Chain length 222, copies 3
């Protein structure tokens, strides 16, 4: 449309759809329950992102938030996406290393707080307070990153793939608060179309690229 | 009230309440954890539907969606219902056959996508796009139906009851996209009061009738 | 601010933050998976409440509901809080006594209905109907309380601590429908600032005081 960010929403929709179908079909012929768990998780993530990208593309997942005086376009739908897909991603990680249930609950819960406070910050109409929600969310994120590094005798195939995904995770997820901060969501240094670009590249890498790495490894098979 | 569909919301409220109390009391005197699981799931479903029917009845779960120019009455509350009650129903099925966790996650996730895209379609103000959400939702549904048929040495009592519920499920759930499509939610061929009627008959059959069948079987006992 | 209830939202924010950090740090040095489960659950609860208190404090989690003619301030954010934190609290209880999965689902589900109907009642614009939602919610509550008392050979350390928390639970949770009923949410007998006070004292006691009791016991260690 007339939304210059449309092309990135379009590309994101397509690439999340294609990764969904790739992983869906790829997961055809899997019988191992454990592999089945990662296929389910890992196919669902871009499946959900596909729907939320499409909802952004079609304009459904977009709202206007008054702040700085202005009517600030906020694609709220990506938080609906992340609300489900980031814990699923963490679940992929958590299951890989067979985390304790307490640790998984800590991660999912901290994740829900990260996304929920990010959404609150995204929709907050007092500009200064946006960054307060950003900060708390970032602290939840740093908590999660902490746990992924200092809280986790697995088979070497698990380890190796975990350590790759874990590095992928930390590098990509850490970029999101920066994009939010510098983008139209936060301080407005970088335009919406570029923030949308950045998040789409991160999301495809964090969802499809992550899943390609994961669904490639024998780590997912018992 | 003046809502001609009220009587069906009224009847649905009553019948979901009565089925809730029937299953609640019926489940009094159950000690087997497994039976306890199906009683919990199966009582919760019409309990939730009771609340959402009442919310529709009282007008709370109703909104107006602009499309075709018009202010289209949309009872959004039934999606809040379904969001919780359809995965629970699938969980009843999944537990019956002791599904793999991956398969359950696939079902619940596909279900959330079915309902969430149905809700997005229901609230979408671009009329043509409504049916795009319908189509994706329908594809999630067909995925679920696929899985219920081609993805599931259980005791013959499990099998038999599973196969009955599974047929009940497929026939009733398949009717909902058709009702949505032809009803005021979709193409508007059939009035809101008749769509509300149709969904109430399906919902009572899919919740109370389903639960009667299930809570009747010894399949639910270990 | 000019919201006389601000001080209580401020105090609640602070005390939930401080309890979050206390339990977070306190939980440093825990390795027992079971203890890890209660630390996770129990730290998350005031962590979530911290965010929702702050959201109330900052004015984000506040809406106006027309009823009696008036624009009635409703802090909806505490229902978002409770939606997650009350099942977690019940989960703390449920895990303590190793409840059956069916019973946990019954509790969480009844809880979701309690909070969801309380939120519906809170946002309902027909004043009389508010108390209908109150009544149903109260019945869900009484169901939960029923289950906590008549539905649960645990080690004596479990029992004892369970029985204390269970009494804490019943006494504190029972006060909330009364506060809602007499407060600005319900019949308006007691002002918003006092209802906010009352709920803050209950919430801190039910979250931090509860968690102090729990995270003090050896009941949480296998
Ligand atoms: C747990 C574990 C962790 C707890 C999380 C801690 C922080 C919780 C914050 C919550 C807040 C939720 C945001 C939303 C409810 C508030 C909407 O109010 C907006 C701002 O006034 C309204 O503007 C416009 C409204 C905008 C629309 C918002 C859409 C969002 C919805 C995403 C959820 C979906 C659920 C499935 C639906 C099918
Ligand atoms: C240690 C604490 C617990 C951590 C919590 C951090 C709270 C975040 C700070 C929020 C607040 C102090 C910033 C307010 C913006 C201020 C610098 C600009 C002047 O205010 C203007 C209106 O008066 C903003 O309009 C528009 C001007 C804008 C273009 C200015 C952009 C603001 C940016 C704020 C970025 C904060 C992060 C970089 C924090 C870094 C860590
Ligand atoms: C340690 C952390 C707590 C941060 C301390 C804060 C100091 C209190 O804020 C005052 C300074 O204006 C008054 O705010 C009054 C205006 C507003 C009230 C302030 C509420 C929030 C600014 C304070 C809540 C803590 C922040 C959270 C930062 C994220 C943290 C987890 C890293
Ligand atoms: C996306 C940007 C535009 C491009 C940035 C490219 C940076 C390249 C990433 C390199 C990192 C990966 C490290 C190599 C790997 C091997 C490490 O494995 C170690 C062995 O267990 C793990 O220990 C400990 C593991 C350590 C790895 C933790 C990663 C840290 C995060 C480093 C970057 C941060 C994200 C950048 C934020 C910026 C975009 C605002
Ligand atoms: C997972 C697994 C799968 C992921 C699902 C993929 C698709 C996700 C779609 C989501 C969208 C949610 C709909 C809602 C948040 C959007 C509301 O915006 C409306 C349309 O502009 C506003 O009009 C009027 C608003 C209307 C009100 C909508 C009510 C709905 C709320 C139902 C959820 C409840 C949660 C528990 C509450 C207690
Ligand atoms: C193969 C694809 C991937 C599948 C995706 C399917 C997308 C759904 C089609 C949507 C769109 C083409 C239909 C638009 C309605 C069009 C026929 C009527 C003319 O447009 C009018 C406004 O210009 C509609 O107003 C009002 C007129 C209405 C009364 C017309 C009702 C429309 C109906 C559409 C029903 C579509 C389903 C039957 C698809 C069957 C499978
Ligand atoms: C609700 C409507 C108004 C009334 C429609 C009445 C149709 C009667 C339903 C019959 C069906 C049940 C089949 C008999 C049963 C026995 C089958 O068991 C088989 C043995 O394992 C299962 O194999 C494979 C199982 C096969 C069963 C799958 C069912 C398919 C769905 C068939 C109908 C579709 C729904 C109708 C959509 C319409 C309302 C738009
Ligand atoms: C399960 C198990 C049990 C099922 C529960 C049975 C009862 C379900 C009731 C549900 C209703 C949800 C309330 C909300 C969706 C309805 C919003 O409509 C309001 C009233 O017209 C709009 O005013 C203003 C809107 C106000 C904002 C409401 C905020 C609420 C959101 C809290 C959820 C959050 C989810 C995570 C977000 C991140
Ligand atoms: C056995 C049933 C299944 C249980 C369901 C209970 C339904 C709750 C009753 C709702 C309704 C009868 C009460 C309506 C308020 C009425 C007493 C006051 C007169 O109506 C006024 C407008 O006409 C209310 O405006 C404003 C006046 C207000 C200040 C009056 C406050 C109303 C209060 C209602 C409190 C009800 C609980 C105490 C129930 C106790 C158990
Ligand atoms: C037993 C329980 C059911 C309560 C019976 C009700 C009686 C029907 O309400 C009529 C009296 O005005 C008509 O309401 C018409 C106006 C409105 C319609 C009434 C709907 C609700 C008032 C009735 C639903 C039951 C209530 C729930 C009370 C909580 C219960 C679980 C304890
Ligand atoms: C918060 C208010 C302002 C202050 C109210 C102070 C009341 C004092 C609470 C005492 C209670 C605790 C009972 C002692 C304990 C020991 C009981 O253990 C028994 C041994 O298994 C359990 O059997 C069965 C256990 C029995 C305990 C169930 C508790 C019941 C609830 C009693 C009060 C109710 C809540 C008050 C509502 C009011 C605030 C509207
Ligand atoms: C087996 C594979 C590679 C899967 C292909 C199926 C569908 C597409 C997904 C694969 C694409 C990219 C891999 C993930 C990493 C990323 C950095 C993607 C960034 C996307 C940018 C838009 C267009 C660029 C492309 C060259 C993919
Ligand atoms: C043991 C039983 C049958 C349960 C009775 C408790 C409460 C009511 C539920 C039972 C009713 C119906 C069975 C489910 C199937 C359906 C097709 C119901 C359609 C409902 C239509 C409205 C009025 C019709 C009735 C004759 C029930
Ligand atoms: C080890 C302990 C006690 C924890 C301290 C960390 C942070 C604060 C939480 C402890 C405070 C209170 C215990 C819970 C019980 C309550 C009745 C609290 C009611 C709060 C009222 C506001 C100010 C009062 C205080 C004296 C705490
Ligand atoms: C699938 C998409 C992924 C993996 C998205 C990850 C997003 C995050 C790690 C976002 C974190 C944010 C913060 C730490 C603070 C500001 C708000 C967020 C939500 C952008
Ligand atoms: C308890 C009620 C039940 C079992 C409801 C089931 C509803 C569905 C199977 C609905 C499916 C739909 C589609 C496939 C597309 C259009 C939207 C829906 C949500 C009506
Ligand atoms: C953390 C906060 C806690 C433990 C809150 C508990 C709240 C309840 C037990 C609330 C119950 C209510 C009813 C029974 C009816 C009216 C509405 C509620 C939600 C206040």
């Amino acid at each position: 449309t007339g939304r210059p960010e449309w092309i990135w929403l379009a590309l994101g929709t397509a690439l999340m759809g294609l990764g969904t179908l790739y992983f869906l079909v790829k997961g055809m012929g899997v019988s191992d329950p454990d592999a089945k768990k990662f296929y389910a998780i890992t196919t669902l993530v871009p499946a959900i992102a596909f729907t939320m990208y499409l909802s952004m593309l079609l304009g459904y997942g977009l709202t206007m938030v008054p702040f700085g005086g202005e009517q600030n376009p906020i694609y709220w739908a990506r938080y609906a996406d992340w609300l489900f897909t980031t814990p699923l991603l963490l679940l992929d990680l958590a299951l890989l290393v067979d985390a304790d249930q307490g640790t998984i609950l800590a991660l999912v819960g901290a994740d829900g707080i990260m996304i929920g406070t990010g959404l609150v910050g995204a929709l907050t109409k007092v500009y200064s307070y946006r960054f307060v929600w950003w900060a708390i969310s970032t602290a939840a994120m740093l908590y999660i990153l902490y746990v992924l590094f200092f809280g986790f005798s697995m088979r070497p195939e698990v380890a190796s793939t975990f350590k790759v995904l874990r590095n992928v995770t930390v590098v990509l997820w850490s970029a999101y608060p920066v994009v939010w901060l510098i983008g139209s969501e936060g301080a407005g240094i970088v335009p919406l179309n570029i923030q949308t670009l950045l998040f789409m590249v991160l999301d495809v890498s964090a969802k499809v690229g992550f899943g390609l790495i994961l669904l490639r490894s024998r780590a997912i098979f018992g």
